[PDB]
Design a protein around this ligand. Structure first.
Ligand code: OXL
Ligand code: OXL
Ligand code: OXL
Ligand code: CL
Ligand code: CL
Ligand code: CL
Ligand code: MG
Ligand code: MG
Ligand code: MG
Ligand code: ZN
Ligand code: ZN
Ligand code: ZN
Lengths: 597, 596, 597
C-alpha cells in the first residue's frame, strides 16, 4: 500500500510532469547514474563527533584553538546547493554519500548539511522530510560533527518567533542529530542572540556564534564597520557564552589583506576558536581563506569542487591542495576529495533545471553586497517582474537601498527586505530621494513596513527617523526585542489544532515543523499521506517519472527493494483520467490519475 | 486461446494497419450498421421449398408460367464486386440474410457466391468462402442461393481438368448452392457441357448463360446478330439447361434491343429466361423495364446503396416502376429501403475501396469493358503511370478487340484484352505495329495462353497472323482444353495439401486447394495464427481498436467476448510492441512485432 | 490598374485562401487542365436560333410539334452543376465550350445555361456577372436557342416580387440573349404565372409554361394529382398564351408507365409542343425519358455524361445512343457528345471542393420527393445542425411535412419551406400531431408562417385551417395573388439609390440585378471594384491562387495576355500585411494584402 502510493506519485508525474521541473531545461539524455565510491575499509575512525562526546563543548572549542592543522567544514550538502541550485538537492543524493565521507575523510571538522533554506525547501518543493534527511546523515556519518545554520531568532524561517519556540526548536534540532549550531542574527545584534545561544548550551551542544561581515575594514572612508566593531562583538559573544566564533562573510566581501588583519585581532580579542565562512562571487575568496589560515584561523568552510565557485563557497580540493605540505596542512586525502567531487558532479547534472545563467566572477559584488545565497534568487525574481534587461540598475538599486536603511547588515532575512525594496525602486522608477520624499506616494512591501516596525530587530544606530515615519504611516515603532513583545505560545494548545487538522498525533519533530512553517508542514503532510515516502525515489524519477519500458529499482524499506517497470500509458479517458500500466515485482498494476493539463 | 489468437490479430493490425487499407482513405470517424428490427414471425416458404418440391426442370417451367417478373438481388456478389473490388465481408453479409428471409420472401434468389468472391475472401479478407455460404444458407433457408460459375474456369482464371470441375460443382451443391448461373467467356457451348452436366447430376438449377456483346440492331456489325443469340439458346436447351440467361456483363443491351431480343428468345425456346446487366451507361433500368414488357421471366438488380454505374441498376426503383402493373413483383418497398439503408451504413465502412467514378458514361458503347472490370483496370493503369491517358487505353481496348477477331469480353477474356490494351499504350503500339512482322514485341503470359487455345475458341477461330506471331514456335490447338488436361489424381493432390498443413482437411477445404493451391495454403496458415477473424466487425478487421475502445465479438454463438484496447506500449528493445487488453473483465497483454 | 486589381485578388487568395474552398477537399495535384476540343473547321450551321427569328415564337412552337425527331435540350451549363456542384461552375469553363456546342451539335434545341440558382451564386460565391456570362455564351453559340429557368413571380429570387419588377427583369433577359424562357410557379398556380407569361410574349420570346409534377398519376390512392390535373392545367396554360408546354419533374418522380399515359394525354389535350425535364435521382429517369420519347414528346432535357446521373439530369450520350437509328433519332453525333463530355469531366475535376458524397440512385426519392437541386443542400443543412446521423428521419419528416401541408408541389421556393419544416421537426423531435397540438408551443420557421400567410400563393385546395391558424399567431392570411398587394417599385428612385451607393451610373442589366438581389449585387459591385475582372482567371487560380514559382497566363482582353509569376511571398509584417512579390510580363510588382488568420 505504501507502494500503491509511490506508484500513484510516479504515475502522476510521468503523465503531468513535476511543476518545478516541467518549465525548465532537462539533463543530458545519456547521463551516468552517479556512482557512490567503494570505501576502502571496514570500520570508521573515531573523529570530531566522539571528541565532542568526550570533551563537551567548551573543552571542544579549546581543542580546536590549540589544534595546529586548519580544520575543515564541507558545505556541499547545504550552502553549496543553496547557492547554485536553489536548495533543490534531495535527501536521496545527500544521504547516499554520507558514509563515503565517513570512511574517506574522518579528519573533517563538520558536515554543513542542515538548516538554512533546506528546512523550508525540502518540504515545500521536494516533498520530503528534513528530519528524516538529518537522521540518514547521522546514521551514515557517526564519526563527524553535523552542522546547521540557525537564523538566531528567525529560526529556520523569515520572521522572529516567540522565545519558547526558538527554545523548543533548538531542543529538537539537538535530539535530531545536530552537533554544531552556527547561529547568527541578521543585524549582528547580540541582545537578540541570547535566547538562542543559551538554548544551545543548555542542550550541551556547540554554540558557534556568528558575526556577519559587511563593508571594508581597510577603507577609512567607510568607518562604521571598522576593526573595533568586530573585535567588540567577538568579546560580546564570548561574554554571552559562545563555544566558537564565526565570521559569516555571506556576500564574499572580505579581501585577503583584510583577513590578515581581522583574524589576527580576533584571536587577540578572544581565546575562543575562530571559524571563517565566505562565498566566492568575487573569484578571489580562496585567497581570503588562505590569508585567514596564515593569520591563524582555526576553521574554514569550502564546497566540493563540483559545486564550488561563483556564488558558492570556494573550491575545497584546491584549498587543501594549496595547504598540502604546510605547517597547517589539514591532513585530507586529495584523491578522495576528488572521488567525492566526481560523484557530486554526476549528482549535479541531474539538477539542470535549477542551474543559473551565471558565467563567472564579478567584482560588481563589492558595489551591491548581495549574499551568495541571494543573487540568483533575486535575478530570477527580477526576471519575474520583467526586469532581466535592467539588471545592473537593479544592482545599483540594491546598493542605494542599503545606504537608505542606514548602511545595514544584509543577510537572511534582512537581505530579502532590501531585495524587495530594490525591485520596487527600479519598477516604479523611484530614486532614494523620491523614496524618502514627503509629496511622493509610495506603497512599501509587507516586509519593509515589518522591519522598520522592529521585527528583524535593531541595528547599532537604530533606523532612520524619516524613512520609517513615512513607511509606518501611523503604526507606532518599537525598539525592544521582538521576542519580548510576542506572547509565549501555548504549546499544548497549538498541538491540538495541528493534530486535529491531521486527525492523528504528530511526532515532537513534526510539531516543530508546524511551529516553524504551519501551512507548509500541513501541505507536506497531506502530500505525505497521498504520495507516501516520495524521498526514496532516485532523482530522475522524482522529477520526470519513468520513461516507456524503463525499469526502476527503489527501496521503500530497509532491505526491501521494489522492481517497478512502466510498460505502457493510456490515452485520456471519458472521465479525464489517465491509466499508467505498471509491472511491480513481476505483478501487473493499473494506476489512474488526472490529466491536470 | 481461440480468443488469444484474435487478440493477436487486433494487436498486429492496430499497430501495423491492414496492408489492403493502410494507405487509402478512411471512413468518417463518425454510425455502425443496425440489423433492422425482427418482425416476430417465422419465415414464409419461398423458391427454395418450391425447388425442393418440383426439381429443376419443373421449377424452370414454373418461372416461365409466372406472370410476375421474378427478381434476383445481387448486392451480395456482383454489386460489391463491381463497386468495391469484391471486398465485402462475411460479417456484414451474413448478418442481414435473416432480414431478407423474413422481409423479402418473394425473391427468386440471392446472388451471393462465386465470381470473384471465392478468391478474394481468403486472399484479401482472411475468411473462408464456404463458411460465408453456410451462414447465408442458415439465415435464408427459404430463398435460392445463386452462384456465378465461370464454366470450365470454375472460380478461377484458367480452364481446369474435367474431374476438378466435376469435384468443385459437387461441393458447391453440398455447400448450399441451388442455382448455378454458368457461362463461358467465348459463348462456347462445347466448353459448357461438363459444367451443365455436373449441375444436373447434383439436381440443382443449371441457368446456362449467353454473354451479350455488340448491338443486334446495328446491321454494320452482323456477327453478333439475333440468330447468333437465338441459335445459342436452342443449343443450350438441348445441352439440358433449366433456364437461359442473358449475361450483359458490360451493359451494352439497349431498350429497343431488349424488346426485340427477349420476344425472339422466348419464341426459340420454351425455357424461362433471366436477364443480368450493369448500369455503366446510366440507362440499364430502361433495358430492364423493356425486357419485362417483353415477358422476360427474371431480372437481376442490386440494392439502391450498391447500385448504379458499374453495378446492376437500382432494385428499389425498378420495383417501384412495376408497382401496380400486371407484372408487379410483390416486394415491399419499405423493406427494400430499410435493407438499402443498411447496405449504405455497411458501405461507408469500405471507404478504402471506392473508385473515383463520377457517374454514367456512354463511352461504354465504344470500349465494352465489363462493369466488374472498369475500376480494376483504371487501378492497374494508375499502377502503370497512365492515369493521364485513360481514354487512349479505352481506345486500345476497342482496337484490341477488333484485332482478336471481335470477341466476347467477360471473365477471364476481359483480363486478356486488358493486358494487351495496357501494353499497347505503354509500348506505343498501333494494331498495325502489333501484328507487324518487323516490330518485335513480348506478349503477356495471359495473351500467349489465350491464343494457344487455353480459354477456348471463338467462332471463326483466332486470326492466323496474330496467332503464329505470338506463338513464336508453339503449335496451337483447337480442341476443348480439358479434353487434353490430365485427369488430376485427386487422392494424390489431397495428400500434398495434408502433409503441408499437418492435418486432415474437409472436402470443401480440398475444393479451395484445387482451385487455388497457393492461395488456400496462405489462408490456412493465417487462420491457425489469427483465428476466426471473420467474426470481427468490419472497422476492427481493417483498423483494429482505438484507445479505450470497447468491442463485442461472438466467438461461438451464445458466447460473446468483450474486448477492450486499454493501452499500447512504445516499442521495446527487442523490436516488439505490447497491446494491453481486457477480455471479459480480465487483463491480457499481447506482444506484436513492429514492421515499420 | 485592372492588372493591379487582379494581382491583388491573386495575392489575397494565395495568402489567405478562398473562403469557399480552403476547408474542403482539393483537386488532384497532377490535374490535367481542360482542353477545348479541336474543331474540324466546318462553318456553323443555322439552327433553332435562325428558325425562331424567322417564324416568331408561335410558329416555332408549331415547328417543334410537327418535327418527327425528338429535340434535345443540354442542361450541363445550368441544372447539371446546380444539382451536382452547388452551382459553382464558372463562366470561364462554361463560355469556353459554347463554340464547340455550336459547331458540333447544331441540331440541339437549346442550351439550358441561365437562371435558376446561377444568377445568385455567380455574384455571391463566384464574384462574377451573370449578364457577362450570358453574353459570352450568346457570342459563342449564335445558332442555338439559349434557355433560362424563370421562377414565375419569384423571378430569379426566393419570393414573389412586384409585377413591374418581374416585367423589368424579363425585358432585360430577352435583351441579354435569352430565347427560351421555362417559367413555373411553385404551386402550379396559373393565376400567379400570367404576368411572367405575358411579359415573355411581349418581348417576342418563347414562353415554355411548366406544369410541375408530383405524386403518381397511376396510383388511385393519391387522387389529388391525377391525369386530369395535368391535362386541365395544360389547357389553361395554352389559354394563357404558352408557346410550349413543359413538364417539370423537379424531383424525378415520373415513372416510365406514367409517362406513356401522360404524354399521349397531353398531346391530345393541346396542340402545343411538349417539353419534358426530370432528374435521375431514382436511377431510372433514362427509362422514363425514352418512354416519353416513344409516346411522342417533342423535347426532353439531358446532361452531358460527366455531369449526369443521380440528382442531375440523366445521361445524354446514352439516351442518344439508345435513340440511334430509331424513327425519332435526334441526329446528334455521339462522338462529338463524348468529346464534349470529356472536356466537362476535366472541367469538373477542378471543382472537387464542391462534390457531395452521394453514392448513387435512391428509391427513397419516391418517399421524400425532394427536388434534385435541393437534395444535397438540404443534406448539408442537416449536417450543419448536428443531424447527419439522422438524415433518414429528415427525409421521413419531409414527407410527413408535405402531407401536413395538404400534399403540395415542392419546388423553388416552396421546397425550402417544407425543408425548414422537416429540420425543425427532427431537431426538436416533433411529430405532425405535436406540431398542430393545442398544448404545445411551436415557433414555426419564417418561411412556413409566410407560406401559410399566402406569400408564395395558393395551392388548389387552400391551406389547412388549423395548422395555418396556429402558425400565424393572430395574423390574417390572404388568398389573392401576392403581387397584387405589393407596392409598384418606384423604378426611377431605386435606380438613384444604387447609383448614389456606388457613385456611378449603372446599366439596365446591373439595375435588374439590383432589383432582384440588392444586397448581393451591391457586394458584388464593390468586390469588382477592388478585385477587377476576376472572371477571366482560370478556375484553379480563382480558388487557390499561385503556388511558389508558378507561371500563370491571363487575358484581361483579347490582344493582351498577362504572364504572372509568384516569385516569393513575405512573412507577415508588423502591420499584419503580407507582401506577395510578382513578376508581370517580366516586370516586378509587389502587392500587399492582409493576413486574415
Ligand atoms: O539560508 C540562509 O539562512 C543563509 O545561508 O543565509
Ligand atoms: O467474376 C466474374 O466472372 C464476373 O463477375 O464477371
Ligand atoms: O433554381 C431553381 O429554381 C430550381 O431549379 O429549382
Ligand atoms: Cl506553512
Ligand atoms: Cl493459390
Ligand atoms: Cl440581396
Ligand atoms: Mg587552531
Ligand atoms: Mg414468367
Ligand atoms: Mg414533334
Ligand atoms: Zn553562505
Ligand atoms: Zn455482372
Ligand atoms: Zn431541374
Amino acid at each position: 500500500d505504501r507502494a500503491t502510493k509511490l506508484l500513484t506519485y510516479l504515475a502522476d508525474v510521468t503523465v503531468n510532469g513535476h511543476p518545478e521541473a516541467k518549465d525548465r531545461p532537462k539533463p543530458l539524455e545519456n547521463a551516468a547514474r552517479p556512482v557512490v565510491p567503494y570505501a576502502n575499509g571496514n570500520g570508521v575512525k573515531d573523529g570530531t563527533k566522539q571528541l565532542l562526546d568526550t570533551l563537551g563543548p567548551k573543552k571542544f572549542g579549546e581543542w580546536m584553538r590549540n589544534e595546529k592543522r586548519v580544520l575543515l567544514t564541507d558545505t556541499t550538502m547545504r550552502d553549496g546547493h543553496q547557492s547554485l541550485l536553489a536548495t533543490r538537492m534531495r535527501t536521496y543524493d545527500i544521504a547516499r554519500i554520507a558514509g563515503t565521507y565517513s570512511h574517506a575523510l574522518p579528519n573533517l571538522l563538520s558536515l554543513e548539511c542542515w538548516g538554512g533554506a533546506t528546512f523550508d525547501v525540502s518540504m515545500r518543493f521536494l516533498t520530503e522530510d528534513p528530519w528524516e534527511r538529518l537522521a540518514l546523515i547521522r546514521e551514515g556519518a557517526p564519526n563527524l560533527l553535523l552542522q546547521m545554520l540557525l537564523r538566531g531568532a528567525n529560526g529556520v524561517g523569515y520572521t522572529n518567533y516567540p522565545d519558547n519556540v526558538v527554545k523548543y526548536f533548538v531542543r529538537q534540532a539537538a535530539k535530531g542529530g545536530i552537533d554544531l549550531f552556527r547561529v547568527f542574527d541578521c543585524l549582528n545584534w547580540v541582545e537578540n542572540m541570547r535566547v538562542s545561544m543559551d538554548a544551545i548550551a543548555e542542550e550541551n551542544k556547540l554554540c558557534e556564534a556568528a558575526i556577519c561581515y559587511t563593508g571594508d575594514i581597510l577603507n577609512s572612508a567607510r568607518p562604521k564597520y571598522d576593526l573595533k566593531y568586530y573585535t567588540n562583538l567577538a568579546v560580546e559573544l564570548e561574554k554571552a557564552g559562545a563555544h566558537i566564533i564565526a565570521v559569516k562573510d555571506m556576500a564574499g566581501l572580505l579581501k585577503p589583506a583584510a583577513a590578515k588583519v581581522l583574524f589576527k585581532a580576533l584571536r587577540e580579542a578572544t581565546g575562543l576558536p575562530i571559524h571563517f565562512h565566505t562565498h566566492d562571487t568575487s573569484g578571489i575568496a580562496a585567497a581570503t581563506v588562505l590569508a585567514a589560515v596564515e593569520a591563524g584561523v582555526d576553521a574554514v568552510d569550502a564546497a566540493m569542487d563540483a559545486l564550488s565557485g561563483n556564488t558558492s563557497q570556494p573550491c575545497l580540493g584546491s584549498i587543501v591542495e594549496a595547504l598540502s605540505g604546510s605547517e597547517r596542512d589539514p591532513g585530507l586525502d586529495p584523491a578522495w576529495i576528488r572521488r567525492i567531487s566526481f560523484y557530486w558532479e554526476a549528482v549535479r547534472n541531474q539538477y539542470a533545471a535549477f542551474e543559473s545563467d551565471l558565467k563567472g566572477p564579478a567584482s560588481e559584488v563589492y558595489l551591491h553586497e548581495m549574499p551568495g545565497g541571494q543573487f540568483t534568487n533575486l535575478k530570477e525574481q527580477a526576471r519575474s517582474l520583467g526586469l532581466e534587461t535592467r539588471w545592473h540598475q537593479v544592482a545599483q538599486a540594491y546598493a542605494d537601498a542599503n545606504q537608505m536603511f542606514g548602511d545595514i547588515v544584509k543577510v537572511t532575512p534582512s537581505s530579502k527586505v532590501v531585495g524587495d525594496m530594490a525591485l520596487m525602486m527600479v519598477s516604479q522608477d523611484l530614486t532614494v530621494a523620491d523614496v524618502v520624499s514627503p509629496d511622493r506616494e509610495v506603497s512599501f512591501p509587507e516586509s519593509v513596513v515589518s522591519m522598520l516596525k522592529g521585527d528583524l530587530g535593531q541595528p547599532p544606530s537604530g533606523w532612520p527617523e524619516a524613512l520609517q515615519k513615512k513607511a509606518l504611516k501611523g503604526e507606532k515603532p518599537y525598539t525592544v526585542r521582538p521576542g519580548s513583545l510576542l506572547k509565549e505560545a501555548d504549546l499544548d494548545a497549538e498541538r491540538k489544532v495541528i493534530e486535529k487538522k491531521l486527525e492523528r498525533e504528530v511526532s515532537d519533530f513534526e510539531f516543530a515543523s508546524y511551529l516553524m512553517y504551519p501551512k507548509v508542514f500541513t501541505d507536506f503532510a497531506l502530500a505525505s499521506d497521498t504520495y507516501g515516502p516520495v524521498s526514496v525515489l532516485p532523482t530522475p524519477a522524482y522529477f520526470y517519472g519513468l520513461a516507456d519500458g524503463e525499469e526502476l529499482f527503489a527501496d521503500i524499506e530497509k532491505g526491501k527493494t521494489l522492481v517497478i517497470v512502466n510498460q505502457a500509458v493510456s490515452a485520456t479517458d471519458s472521465q479525464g483520467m489517465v491509466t499508467v500500466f505498471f509491472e511491480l515485482n513481476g505483478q501487473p498494476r493499473r494506476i489512474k490519475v488526472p490529466d491536470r493539463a
